[PDB]
Structures are given as structure tokens and as C-alpha cells.
Symmetry: C6
Amino acid sequence: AIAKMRTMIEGFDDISHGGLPIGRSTLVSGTSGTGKTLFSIQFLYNGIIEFDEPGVFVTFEETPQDIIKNARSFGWDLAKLVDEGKLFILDASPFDLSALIERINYAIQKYRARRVSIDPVTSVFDASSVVRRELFRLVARLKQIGATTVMTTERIEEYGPIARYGVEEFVSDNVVILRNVLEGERRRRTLEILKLRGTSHMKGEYPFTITDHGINIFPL
Amino acid sequence: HQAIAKMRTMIEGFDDISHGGLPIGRSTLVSGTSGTGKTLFSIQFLYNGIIEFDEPGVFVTFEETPQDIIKNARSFGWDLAKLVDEGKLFILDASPDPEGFDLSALIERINYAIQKYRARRVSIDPVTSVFQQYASSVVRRELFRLVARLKQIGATTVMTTERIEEYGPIARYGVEEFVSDNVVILRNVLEGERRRRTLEILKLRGTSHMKGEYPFTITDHGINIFP
Amino acid sequence: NSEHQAIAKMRTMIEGFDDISHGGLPIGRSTLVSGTSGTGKTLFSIQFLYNGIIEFDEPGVFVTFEETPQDIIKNARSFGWDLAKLVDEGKLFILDASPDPFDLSALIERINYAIQKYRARRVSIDPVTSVFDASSVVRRELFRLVARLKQIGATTVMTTERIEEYGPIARYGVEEFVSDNVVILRNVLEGERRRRTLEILKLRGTSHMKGEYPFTITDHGINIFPLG
Amino acid sequence: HQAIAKMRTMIEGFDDISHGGLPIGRSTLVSGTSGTGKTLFSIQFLYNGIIEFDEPGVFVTFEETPQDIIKNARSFGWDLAKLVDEGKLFILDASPDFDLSALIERINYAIQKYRARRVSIDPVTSVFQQASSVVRRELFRLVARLKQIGATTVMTTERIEEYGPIARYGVEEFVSDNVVILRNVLEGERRRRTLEILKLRGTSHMKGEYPFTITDHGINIFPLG
Amino acid sequence: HQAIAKMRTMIEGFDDISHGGLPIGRSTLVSGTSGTGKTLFSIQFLYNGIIEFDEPGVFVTFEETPQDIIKNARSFGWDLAKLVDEGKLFILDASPFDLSALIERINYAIQKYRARRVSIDPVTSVFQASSVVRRELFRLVARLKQIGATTVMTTERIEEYGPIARYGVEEFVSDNVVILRNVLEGERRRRTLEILKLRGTSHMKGEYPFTITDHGINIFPL
Amino acid sequence: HQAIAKMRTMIEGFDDISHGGLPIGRSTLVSGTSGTGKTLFSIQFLYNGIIEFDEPGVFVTFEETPQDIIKNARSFGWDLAKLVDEGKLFILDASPDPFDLSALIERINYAIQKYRARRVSIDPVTSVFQASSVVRRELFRLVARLKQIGATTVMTTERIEEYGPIARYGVEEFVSDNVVILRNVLEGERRRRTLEILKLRGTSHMKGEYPFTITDHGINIFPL
Ligand SMILES: Nc1ncnc2c1ncn2[C@@H]1O[C@H](COP(=O)(O)OP(=O)(O)OP(O)(O)=S)[C@@H](O)[C@H]1O
Ligand SMILES: Nc1ncnc2c1ncn2[C@@H]1O[C@H](COP(=O)(O)OP(=O)(O)OP(O)(O)=S)[C@@H](O)[C@H]1O
Ligand SMILES: Nc1ncnc2c1ncn2[C@@H]1O[C@H](COP(=O)(O)OP(=O)(O)OP(O)(O)=S)[C@@H](O)[C@H]1O
Ligand SMILES: Nc1ncnc2c1ncn2[C@@H]1O[C@H](COP(=O)(O)OP(=O)(O)OP(O)(O)=S)[C@@H](O)[C@H]1O
Ligand SMILES: Nc1ncnc2c1ncn2[C@@H]1O[C@H](COP(=O)(O)OP(=O)(O)OP(O)(O)=S)[C@@H](O)[C@H]1O
Ligand SMILES: Nc1ncnc2c1ncn2[C@@H]1O[C@H](COP(=O)(O)OP(=O)(O)OP(O)(O)=S)[C@@H](O)[C@H]1O
Ligand SMILES: [Cl-]
Ligand SMILES: [Cl-]
Ligand SMILES: [Cl-]
Ligand SMILES: [Cl-]
Ligand SMILES: [Cl-]
Ligand SMILES: [Cl-]
Ligand SMILES: [Mg+2]
Ligand SMILES: [Mg+2]
Ligand SMILES: [Mg+2]
Ligand SMILES: [Mg+2]
Ligand SMILES: [Mg+2]
Ligand SMILES: [Mg+2]
């Protein structure tokens, strides 16, 4: 079948029927504070700690120092991983996609990375046609490189377009939606795997919490 | 000159819903949100043509590489690599440059493959890419040309397109369903926190079909619809 | 037709429609027929011409803007209608204004020439939407078309597209105001089932039944069921 | 020194709902979706004025030809050609084959020539269809000139939703002294016609929707208390 | 020195809801769809100031002529012509934009009539970019404040439960906001008044039903 | 392991919901429709800092004048003029007169140094921008500079719907480290005020809406 890499994010590998397909790109979309960055960091962190698979984290707005500081509260020492050459945080603050792809490819080769997180890829972008065009090019090259990639995207409603530009979910191999739904006056976080090309997966929404240990999903 | 004939898809349940299959020599639009089964439907159409009727097929891919189309079909126990090695399936790669729109050129290429592989079935996935660059009025007219030129070749064609809501416009520009002869809608609807897949034949010009939505699942044997 | 109404009508002979319209379509006027995709717009317009020819020997002109004459003819065989025979006999003319795989003045003259040449009493234009970008220019051009057909004395069915079952009548928000008569075909999806209805929204100068009436499309074309 | 007085429409039910009729010397906007009875309301207003009170009328049409107006009015038992012949009704044809100032002067000569007290303009929308700021200013000017002339005027406008904007540009209902809304509501596959007086500046009226039908004798509105 | 003082409207029910009336020396936005009672409220504010407190008023009108304002107020048994003749009320005709000039005219009228109360109806007429609307309205509000007027400014809106005014900014530069609604439900209309906000002071919350009668606005406590 | 430090607002109920207060050295977006208590929250933040912890504060105003801000705070029994006199509070008047972001930042930096304030409120930050993508770039720049200074900052923003976009341009909530939403929901003719902490990067907080009232004592939130 299709080989999958384990995220080791509690509950997620069950929902994805074994993890994220190796060598492919997964879109992780959500409104603000849904857990996008956390998912993308946990993906790299677990890869390093449990499988010694090095990772590249690409950030467009949040600084490397804040990413590191924020991860500290889950008890994750990212600076240590950076110091040991197992993690590389690529600062993409200030669009030349060619330059970005070359920088990513270089980091991947230099750190021998198997896992890549790009957070958020919507910061790369104004017509739908060109967004789709340029996103496709990024996805295609990471595939050629053989990276397994998480790309986060922003969205503005819980039920509504998958991402900002109405094309991102059609270009990605895999699509994960993080929701933070307000019901009555209470928030409930859920994760859904909408699509995984070429393989089976659990369907619909599953509740999760963010705790001191990161994302915890219960597929029941 | 006779009331339009149909070719069996052999996709279980679909030939009942369509009262005989897809109208021959015409295009059928298959529209749906992400991960609804559009590529799968279009592959299963060709695969069944080859296996059940020894009718060769041409698959036109605009985004996925042929290798990924092949890989993704293994999930269903379909050996597309062998079908390609045998000359029964041809995957026409129209996907673009990773490292660096002419419609009649595409038609030229499709027509050539159709003649070379003696193909009776064609899939184009996703059609959206043809009209991707541009106004609803422009999209409309470009889809019109493609449909017409495919009809001239005699191809029976499945063409897929995208939509972003389960119960909103048929496709993206609000014109695709008016230019198409035949329209199928794949939905993936939330009920509670669970999903329910359905297939609808909205229209088939000049012929009959069952109405409304019918539930289906995607399994290890592909699409399974229950009328 | 009931006697005490101001506007003379011609019968469509479409089962149930002449009841709902209280006698048929107003003579010498245009009737807008709008609907989402696959609602029966072309079928209604063809059935109007076919019945006119078959029942009253009234010749008809069909103006098609996207479907080819060959496909209109082919699809009509679904109903056991031999339109090629009527074209051969000079009783039906299909005017092909469909795109090569907009000059309205030239179009009107083609239509006029065909109507004179074939001595046609019934005209169908399918879809008039394709004639058209500002709502104001759509309105005056539609108005111009309607006025010329009226001067010519034709009785016309003009189909238009719409994208929601309940929502705008046509595409530009003006078509239903310029037309004398408005018919809406719906194909409502509810609880995973489709049901077709026809509504006569307005008919200037006469009464008509109000609201939605069910219909089906079968081997014999449109069948409408008027209810109390 | 008195609060504004009203002119009877003699449209069944309407003079009750408006507590006496349309405010005299002012314009009333009558808005509705397609086939709601706007032209009917605006004709019935003139027709009743002539028949019941010998008050001459001017009808300004921007789309429908005078011939079709006259023909369609026979549906309601009205012989408008006879009224035109007697010089009690004048139909001013402003329909297309827009200088508003010029049109206003032409309306004024008719009003003077036929000594009209009642005016209908149908639809005042089509004047405008070629910026809301411009629509507002031009409508205001037309309303003010009619008021100066002393006419009591019905102005129809189009709208595209039963329970949405009052008219097309989101400004008509603010520059009008009086607003009437004709609806044609579709519920459970049946249509229900209703009439509402939304506002009459400086005077009272009944509130909300009242059901009506169109008959061989025109509009019949049904109040109930 | 103190929390802000209020000036009584004497509009039945309103001084209760607002716990004393309108904040003195400030502007209150009064927003509403067509025929909600905006003009009536702004007239009744001036009329009561004159009749009850001998506080002169300036009414700024942008579309309705002074003659029609006066005529329409007869519906309530108010003789505004008399008050204008006595020098207690001035109807400033800004009918059929230079905001600086308008403001100097208002200032001139306030000085001339020693007015304490001002109504501007509708202030949206001044603006027919949301960014320029915001800056113009803020400028108008600040000058009125500097002059010392207590002001009612009405605005149009097009939905009962949508944006507060037309440009999506008017409620943010106003110190005080009142919304008049005329909600259609099951074929019946129901008028309500709501005090949405009064900066730096208290007020009752939500919608209160009111009617317009022969004697003006009556607000009922629910 | 290592927790994000927070400074107490001492606003009744808020420090419970935020599990300790606002993240120190960062900006917290406080968004809401008109009259939701945005300015009051901003002021109470600074006021409580001075009164309870002797932490000086800088209030940056963009429309309301200092005199009106002072006048309105009297509603709650707070004497801000006295605090300005004692050099404990500085009101930075950037309000209109009848836009250079770098100058403003330098003005704020100078005031922060001069008064050695730990707490800053910018009300409303929307006035800085009024294209969504340039708004995003500008707001980011402001957040970064304030962070560079070490200020703990409340930034208010406007929104026009109770359950729509967090703020006006659909980007402000993505650039901010922390996001608080004040709502004033109209249901069945009655209004209900609620506060929600939507997001605090790097740290925990209670979820959903909590009802509050505005009274003579300012904001009172009920975590129930
Ligand atoms: N130690 C913790 N314990 C509990 N919840 C935490 C903890 N750390 C962070 N969180 C929660 O996780 C959220 C942050 O998740 P992120 O992954 O940063 O979200 P995000 O979707 O990337 O949001 P952006 O980029 O700001 S739009 C915070 O808003 C908290 O609710
Ligand atoms: N063996 C399998 N069993 C069950 N479901 C499967 C299996 N293989 C694939 N799927 C499902 O099929 C979906 C993929 O269907 P596709 O036909 O590729 O969808 P699509 O509509 O073409 O989506 P795009 O092109 O990426 S937007 C996956 O998201 C899975 O849910
Ligand atoms: N023999 C038949 N029996 C039953 N239904 C039929 C038959 N032939 C055609 N139909 C139906 O009629 C529909 C076609 O109606 P049309 O008149 O072509 O619609 P249309 O409104 O003109 O749609 P367009 O032009 O494609 S948007 C098909 O989608 C079928 O559902
Ligand atoms: N004798 C009658 N009995 C009952 N209803 C009638 C009769 N005559 C006409 N009608 C109705 O009156 C409607 C037309 O009324 P109009 O006043 O023309 O409406 P309208 O709002 O002006 O429509 P426009 O201008 O075409 S959008 C028709 O659609 C019929 O429903
Ligand atoms: N004597 C009265 N008795 C009852 N209601 C009355 C009386 N006089 C006027 N009204 C009502 O008051 C309304 C007019 O209120 P206004 O204050 O003019 O509203 P408005 O919001 O200013 O409307 P505009 O400016 O036309 S959008 C009328 O539509 C009547 O419903
Ligand atoms: N003493 C008080 N008692 C009760 N409520 C009060 C008191 N003082 C003020 N308020 C309320 O506080 C609100 C003002 O809150 P603000 O913080 O000024 O709101 P805001 O969100 O900044 O509004 P803007 O800036 O005008 S959009 C008023 O509308 C009153 O409802
Ligand atoms: Cl959580
Ligand atoms: Cl499934
Ligand atoms: Cl049917
Ligand atoms: Cl009726
Ligand atoms: Cl009332
Ligand atoms: Cl409160
Ligand atoms: Mg993030
Ligand atoms: Mg696909
Ligand atoms: Mg058709
Ligand atoms: Mg009319
Ligand atoms: Mg008014
Ligand atoms: Mg404020």
C-alpha cells in the first residue's frame, strides 16, 4: 500500500489509518488559535525524538525565538534540537517563491530532513489561478525532493471555505481541518481528516484538547 | 439519428441511477468539493471500460502525476501500471511545470491518443485547469469549445470540476452546468459530526435518469452506490 | 380559454399549462421561462413549437444560442418527436445562433427574415441570456428584442437561466420586469429528493393560477398537474 | 395651520389603512417585485380620481407603451381610451425607442394642459437605472418639483426580494414622503399578496401587512380587527 | 469634578431608560430604517427643551424643507412656526459638500439664538470612503462639543438587525448611540428604541417598545 | 515545564479566565462592537497596575481626547488626572486635529522610557490603518516593536458583528499573540455582555464566553 509516517500525535495516527503518507503534502487549516502551529511543531518534534527524523520548520510571521519560547510550555526544548542539528527553523519573514523553495531544499539537504512544516503557507500569498499555480509548484517540488510536509493555512469561519483562497484544498494530497466551534457559549475543538489521496481514513470530526502535552485527540 | 444511447460504467448502482450509463459520444461533468471521489469516479470509468468491455481509455491529468494516479489506485486493487504497460490505458500528462492556455493543442493531443490507443472512453481531471486562467462569460465559452470538439472526435468523456459548497452552485463559475450536456454532483455532507457521501445525476440532456441524491461509500473496490 | 379576460391567448397544448395560464400564452407577446440547469426550459420551448405545428399547422422558429440544431433534433427524439421531418417540410426552422467551436441588430434581422420566410406564428429563443454587461444595458436590449417581436406579431417563449430555486428570477434582476409574462421552472431538492414545479408568476392583463404546480418530464414531454 | 389632508383613492380597503387616502400634494412610493400590482395601483388611483371626483390624471410610462397600458386596463373593466378621448386622462409616453429636468417640464405642461390633480409615474426606477448618491439627488428633485406643482403622485419602483430592501438603490424610501410596499409572498407553494403602508410623513396609518387580491375590479384589500 | 450630567428630553419613557436624559454637551446618534421616528425624536428633543425649560433649539435639515417639518409637526399639535417666530427655534435649511461652512452656520445659529439644543437630521446627508466619513463626523462632533451644544444626530440604516448606520463607522466616533427599530414579524410591525451605548455613564439595556401617537413618542418599560 | 509569565489585570474574574492575567511582554488584542467596554478594559488594565502594583502606564488615544477619557473614567470613581499629575499615568494624545507609524512608535517608546511604564494601552489600534495585507504587515510591525521594548500591551479593535470576523480586516487576530473578544449579544430584545479569551499563544486559558457587567466599579466578569 501507501507508506505512512507516524505523527505520534495522540489519536491522529488512528484517524489517518497509520499516519501521513510519506513524500506528500498535508494541508492543516483552521481559524485563529485552533492549534495549527502546535500540530506542525509536534509533527517535527515527535519525528526527531522518537524516530531521529530531522525536521525543517518554515515560519513566515512568528519569530524562531517565540516558536521556541511557546513550545517550552509543552516541555519541549527546541533550542536543544536546533543546537544538535536535528531541527532547523527557517525564518521567512521579510513574494519570491523560487527563492523560498531553494532555501527549503537547501535546509532539507543540509539537515537531512524527512519532515517539513510550513506555517502558514497562506503567507506566501492575489488571483486564485496564480495562488493555485504557485501552491502547486511548491507541493510538486517538495514531492520531488521527497519531503513529507505539513502546510498550515488560515480560514475565517468554522464551516465555510477550507482555506483563504478556495483552491488550496484541491492542490494538496491530504487535508486536515482544525475547528474551534462555539456552541452555546462553549468552545469545542475538533479535528477532521477531510481527504487523504490514495488511502483510507476515519471520517468526520473528532474532539481534541490542547494540554501541557500538546494535542490530544479522541477518535472514540 | 436515434434517441441517445448509453455506455455502461459498471460502477455499481450508477448504471441504475443513469438508466443505462453515460450518454455515448458526449461529456459528463462531475462536480464536487475536495475529496468527494471525482478522480476515483473518472478512473473507475476507464478501468471498468478496459476490464469489462476491452474498451481502451485515455486519462488526461492536469495536476496529479501519472505515477501518483497509478499509486493512488492501488488502494482499490487496480493495477493501472499493468494497464498502461499493456497499451489499454493511456495516461496523458497535461500537468504543468514544476521547474519552469492552448486548447486546440490539448484536443490535438487527446485526439491522437484516442486514435493511437483506439480508445472509447476519456477522462479529464480536473477540467477546471483548462479555464483556470480567467470572468464567468469566458469560462463558459471555453468549456463550450472543449465539449464541442470532444463531441466531434466521438469520445465519451467524464470531466471533473470543483465546487466549494455542498448545497450551492454546481461548479465554480455558475456556468459549467448550463454548457454541459450531462451533470453529476458528488457531495460529502456533515450529519452531526459524521460525513455522508451522495451522488446525484442532476441532468442528462435527451434522456432519462433517477432523481435526487443516492448515498455511496468509497471502499477497497472503489465507489459503491445504493439506489 | 375563459371568455371574460382582456388578452387573447394561444394554446401550448402542453398538458396542464393552458389550465394554469387560463387559456395559454398571450398572443403577440413574449413569455419569459426561467429555471436552473436541467429544469425543462428547452423542452418547454420545443414543445411549444411542436404542438403549434402538429395541432394547428402554425409554423415555428427556434432560435438556439448554444445547443446545435443536430443535438436539439437528437434530444427531441427522447419524446418521439421527429423535428428533422418538420424542418424538411418547412414547418419548423431552427435558427443556429450557437458559437463557432454580440450583434443584436443582425440577430433580430435574421429572426425577422426567418419568421417572414416560414410564416411562423410561434418563436422560441433559447436562452435569451446568451444575448448578453450592465443590468441597464441588458434591460434595454431585452426591451428592444421584446418590442421588435411584438411589432412582428410573433408569440414568443424566451428562456433564461437562474442559479437558485428560490432567489433571483433570472440572471440580471431586470428580465422579469421587462417581460409581459414570467414562468418559473423549479427543480427543488429537499430531503435528498427532487420535485419539479412550474409557476406562472405574472401575466400582464389577465388572471392565471398562482403559486407552484407539480410537473414531470417523461417520454411524452412535460406533464403539468393543476390542483385546486 | 392644519395637519396634512388626504385624497381618497377609493381603492377598496386602502383609504381605511391610510386613514383617509394619500397625503395631498405629495408623492407616494409604491414598491414591489415583478407582477405585484404596481401598475394596477397607479392606474386605479388615476381612474378612480376621474370617475369618482372628476379629477384629471396624468400617467407617465417609462417602459410599457400607452397602447399596452390601455389594453391591459380592460382586464379591470376600465376604458382608458375613452378617458383619453375626453381629455380626462393623459398618458405621457416616456418609454424608450435621460434628461430629468426636461422630462419634468414635459410632465408639468401635461398637468397644466389637462388640469390634473393626480399623477402616476411608472416606474420611476427606470429613470435611474443608468451611483445611489445620484439616484437620491435626482429623485429628490423630481419629488420637490411635483410638490411645487401641487400634484398628488404615485411613483412606482421595483425591488427584487419580498423582505429585503424597499427599492433598488437603498435610498428611494428615504427621500419619499410616503412608502407603500406590495408583496407577493411564496410560502408552501402558494402565493399571498399583501400591501403595507410603511410610512406617511406627518400623519397616521395602519401598520404591517394586509392581504389583498387582484380581481376583475382591480385591487381589493382586506383589513381585519 | 464629576461623572457626566444629563439633560432631560421629557420624551415619555426615555429619561427613565437613559437614567436622566442625554449626556450634556455631547452628540447622540439616533439611527433607524425608513419612517422609524428619527425626525420626530429630534424634533421632540428641541420642542420639549423650549416648552419645558425655555432652552432654544436649532434644527438642521438636509432634505425636508422647513415648511414640511412645520407642516408634519402639526400632526402632533405642535406649532413650530410660532416657536420660530418667537426666536426660540431655528430651522436651518441645509437643503438641495462643504462641512466647514455648514459647521460655521450651525455655530452662528447657536450664538444668535442662544441655543442649548441642536438636532441634525440626517447627518448621513453630509457624506453622500468610510475613512473620510469617519474623519468628517469626528470633526463635526468635536466642534459641537467645543461649542457646548447637546446634539441629536440622526442616521439612516437599511436593516433592523444589521449595521448601526450606513458606513459602519458612525457608531464608533459617536459618544452616544440610540437605535430605533421597526421590526416586521408575522405581518405586524413593532417599534422599539434601544440605547446601545452612552460613554462614561449608565443606561438601561436592550429594546423597549414604543408607539408614535398624536402627542409624539411614548416609550414603555418592558 | 516552562510557563509563559503573566501580569495580573486585577479586573474581577479576568485573571481567573486567563489563568494569571495577560502574558508579560506581549500585546493582547481586545476586539468588540460599539460600546462593548473596550476602552474601559484598556483603562482598568492601566489603572489597576498603578494602584495595585505601582506599575506606571501609558494610554495611547486615537480619537477620544484625554479630557473625555478622564471625564468618562469618573463614572467609575477613578481620578485619572491625579494619576497623570503624580506622573504614574501618561495619556498619549494621537487623536485627530482639524499616518506615520514610526513616529508614533518612537513617541510611545519615549513615553515608556520617560514614565518607566510597564503597561501600555492603545485604543483603538484600528485607527492606525484606516488592503487587508498591508494592514497585516503594519500591525505585525507594531506588535514586534512593542515586544522589543518589553511593554505588556492592550490593543483595542473594532468589529461590526457579534459572531463574525474577530476584527475589521480579517487579519488582526492572526497577527496577535493573544486575542480577547468582548461581545454584546442582542437576543429576544435583551443584551448580554460576554468576554472570551479566544487565544493566548504559549499558555493556557479558560475557553468560551463568560458573562460580565459594567457597573460603577468597572468590568465584573462571572466565571461562575
Ligand atoms: N500549555 C498549554 N496548555 C494548554 N493550552 C495551551 C498551552 N499552550 C498553548 N495552549 C493553547 O494553544 C493555543 C495556541 O495554539 P497554536 O498552535 O499556536 O494556534 P494557531 O492555530 O497556530 O494560531 P495562530 O497562528 O496564532 S492564528 C492557545 O491559544 C491555547 O489555547
Ligand atoms: N481504499 C480506500 N478505502 C476507502 N476510502 C478510500 C480508499 N482509497 C481512497 N479513499 C478515499 O478516497 C478519497 C480520494 O478520492 P479522490 O477521487 O482522489 O477525490 P477527489 O474528489 O478527486 O479529490 P481532489 O482531486 O484531491 S479535490 C480519499 O480522501 C479517501 O477518503
Ligand atoms: N425521455 C425522458 N424521460 C424522462 N425525463 C427525460 C427524458 N428526456 C429528457 N428528460 C429530462 O429532461 C431534462 C432535460 O431538460 P431540458 O429541457 O434540456 O432542460 P434545460 O432547462 O433546457 O437545461 P439546460 O439547457 O441543459 S441548462 C433531462 O435532464 C432529463 O431529466
Ligand atoms: N382580471 C384579473 N383578475 C385577477 N388578476 C389579474 C387580472 N388582471 C391582471 N391580474 C394580475 O395582475 C398582474 C399584473 O399586475 P401589474 O399591475 O401589471 O403588476 P406590475 O407590478 O406593474 O408588474 P410589472 O410592471 O410587469 S414588474 C398579473 O400578473 C395578474 O396576476
Ligand atoms: N399623528 C400621528 N399618529 C400616529 N403616528 C403618526 C402620526 N404622525 C406621524 N406618525 C408616524 O410617524 C412616522 C413618521 O416619522 P418620522 O419621524 O418622520 O420618521 P423618519 O425616521 O424621520 O422617516 P424618514 O425621514 O422619512 S426616513 C409616520 O410614518 C407615521 O407612521
Ligand atoms: N457607571 C456606569 N454604570 C454602568 N454602566 C456604565 C457606567 N459607565 C459606563 N458604563 C457603560 O460602559 C459603556 C462604555 O464602555 P466603553 O469602554 O467606553 O466602550 P467602547 O467599547 O470603548 O465603546 P466605543 O469606543 O464608543 S465603540 C457605556 O455604553 C455604558 O453602557
Ligand atoms: Cl483545549
Ligand atoms: Cl466512504
Ligand atoms: Cl420528472
Ligand atoms: Cl390575487
Ligand atoms: Cl406606532
Ligand atoms: Cl452591563
Ligand atoms: Mg500559529
Ligand atoms: Mg482528484
Ligand atoms: Mg436547454
Ligand atoms: Mg408594471
Ligand atoms: Mg425624517
Ligand atoms: Mg472606546
